Design a protein around this ligand. Structure first.
Ligand code: SRM
Ligand code: SF4
Ligand code: K
Length: 456
């Protein structure tokens, strides 16, 4: 169980070659697993740190987790600055004992690929003339719950206000320390920032942060999100550069018969001029490809099976690791997803909505690593082959889905979705997402204030 610290998911080809060798020669599984926090994991290590240190990498007493940063912004020029900040915040937070783990992100609107609402502290980038001027601060998200425990809940992050770029580190430090001091001491299931906020009140927490940071928050600056998915395929970057995002099912990199994904990426790493970017959706970006090099890269990716076409549905689906390695797993997630989506693909076709997508996620237990508590349709593992079915989130990930059915099997889940997708296909307004539709049509009540109305 080794996971590397890699702010913003940026990894060089020199580092990639080193981790590729290790994975193949020194682990039981022989795979590289991309995580939804923009980093990677080895499974079944039979020296790991010596290998990491040799290529300038380190593995994380420390309660901090990998700092995320939007991987492929529409305004491509903004990535460099945003990434510099994610790296500075990461280094700033490097070892104070936090009550529970603390998660941070740097977001570039209109993309919410990093799923800000699942994190403790989020810096939403505000730019003026292609340059960052400051950040809107949102605090308090977290998705972990305990089955049947109405004292636990998934919570979205709350807006605090805007801060100029110069106050970033002082503000980051103030949020961390306030949480460290005010976090619950008796209980660990109630130590997370989301619980502290609900206990003391957002304004109380905000006031202490301003006091500690020595600033006063300005009113929030306008921002909107349009989606959370990756931009699969080729997109034009800045200058004569291009970015190729490869869809990797479950982020599982291994050589399969007829699809040598691992060898393919190694061959690309050997000729690639730039670096790679691991996304929050468990995919990989071959970044900074000069136009002249496009054909060489695509040839390898094509031959290796890395560019095999899948439906928009599959591109917007996700699952956590779960079995066989997770010791806390209740139901299959990663190993269940491929065939489950084969079934969903058929239902979408049956109803004439094959070009559409529903943000669908499977998490193996309520800890919520697969981020099902921010999905339009979320499945939460309860027992072998059984899940709680949640409905009602939205495409952008700003609403928690309420439990619709409890402890049901795949056939029961499919039967319910066949009916609902059928209704959505016929009764939806123009451009209306599935989650919003279930709420509008009265199929499920929305969750308007999680700490108080998540549980029926
Ligand atoms: C690999 C990954 C899932 C994936 O398929 O991508 C994952 C895998 C594990 N997570 Fe996580 N978590 C992953 C993202 C998250 C997320 C989502 C996110 O951060 O974007 C969450 C939900 C958001 C949240 O924290 O509220 C999440 C909430 C947890 C929790 C519940 C924490 C809590 O506040 O209660 C645990 C259990 C714990 O810490 O006690 C945990 C525990 C674990 C462990 C380490 C199990 C353990 O403690 O022994 C899992 C290892 C499985 C394995 O064999 O590899 N993981 N986990 C993600 C690794 C990210 C990373 O590089 O750090
Ligand atoms: S949600 Fe549960 S089963 Fe899935 S990786 Fe996290 S801890 Fe393991
Ligand atoms: K993926």
């Amino acid at each position: 169980l080794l996971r590397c610290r890699l702010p913003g998911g940026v990894i060089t080809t020199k580092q990639w070659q080193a981790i590729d060798k290790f994975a193949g020669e020194n682990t039981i599984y022989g795979s590289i697993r991309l995580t939804n926090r923009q980093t990677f994991q080895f499974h079944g290590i039979l020296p790991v740190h010596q290998m990491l240190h040799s290529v300038g990498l380190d593995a994380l007493n420390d309660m901090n987790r990998n700092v995320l940063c939007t991987s492929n912004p529409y305004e491509s020029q903004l990535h460099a600055e945003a990434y510099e900040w994610a790296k500075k915040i990461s280094e700033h937070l490097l070892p104070t004992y936090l009550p529970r783990k603390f998660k941070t992100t740097v977001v570039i609107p209109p993309q919410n690929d990093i799923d800000l609402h699942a994190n403790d502290m989020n810096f939403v980038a505000i730019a003026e003339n292609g340059k960052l001027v400051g950040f809107n601060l949102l605090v308090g998200g977290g998705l972990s719950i305990e089955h049947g425990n109405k004292k636990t809940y998934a919570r979205t992050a709350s807006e605090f206000g805007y801060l100029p770029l110069e106050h970033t580190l002082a503000v980051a430090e103030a949020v961390v320390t306030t949480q460290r001091d005010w976090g619950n001491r008796t209980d660990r299931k109630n130590a997370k920032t989301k619980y502290t906020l609900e206990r003391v009140g957002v304004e109380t927490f905000k006031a202490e942060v301003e006091r500690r940071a020595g600033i006063k928050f300005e009113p929030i600056r306008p921002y909107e999100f349009t989606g959370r998915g990756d931009r699969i395929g080729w997109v034009k970057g800045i200058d004569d550069n291009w970015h190729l995002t490869l869809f990797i099912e479950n982020g599982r990199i291994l050589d399969y018969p007829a699809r040598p994904l691992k060898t393919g990426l190694l061959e690309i790493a050997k000729i690639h001029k730039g670096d790679f970017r691991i996304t929050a959706n468990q995919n990989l970006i071959i970044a900074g490809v000069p136009e002249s090099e496009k054909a060489k890269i695509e040839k390898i990716a094509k031959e290796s099976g890395l560019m095999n076409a899948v439906t928009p549905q599959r591109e917007n689906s996700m699952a956590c690791v779960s079995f066989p390695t997770c010791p806390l797993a209740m139901a299959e997630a990663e190993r269940f997803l491929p065939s489950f989506i084969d079934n969903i693909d058929n239902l979408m076709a049956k109803h004439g909505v094959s070009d559409e997508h529903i943000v669908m996620r499977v998490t193996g237990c309520p800890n919520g690593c697969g981020r099902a508590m921010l999905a339009e349709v979320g499945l939460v593992g309860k027992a072998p082959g059984r899940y709680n079915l949640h409905l009602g989130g939205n495409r952008i990930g700003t609403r928690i889905p309420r439990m619709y059915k409890e402890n049901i099997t795949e056939p029961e889940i499919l039967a319910s979705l066949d009916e609902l997708i059928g209704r959505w296909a016929k009764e939806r307004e123009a451009g209306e997402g599935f989650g919003d539709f279930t709420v509008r049509a009265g199929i499920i009540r929305p969750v308007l204030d999680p700490a108080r109305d998540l549980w029926d």
